[PDB]
Amino acid sequence: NLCASLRARHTIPQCRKFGRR
Secondary structure (H helix, E strand, C coil), X not given: CCCCCCCHHHHCCHXXXXXXX
């Protein structure tokens, strides 16, 4: 959702759950 920058994939693990593909 809010996750956009690669930083989220590092400081925001929730980003990983959001995107799986």
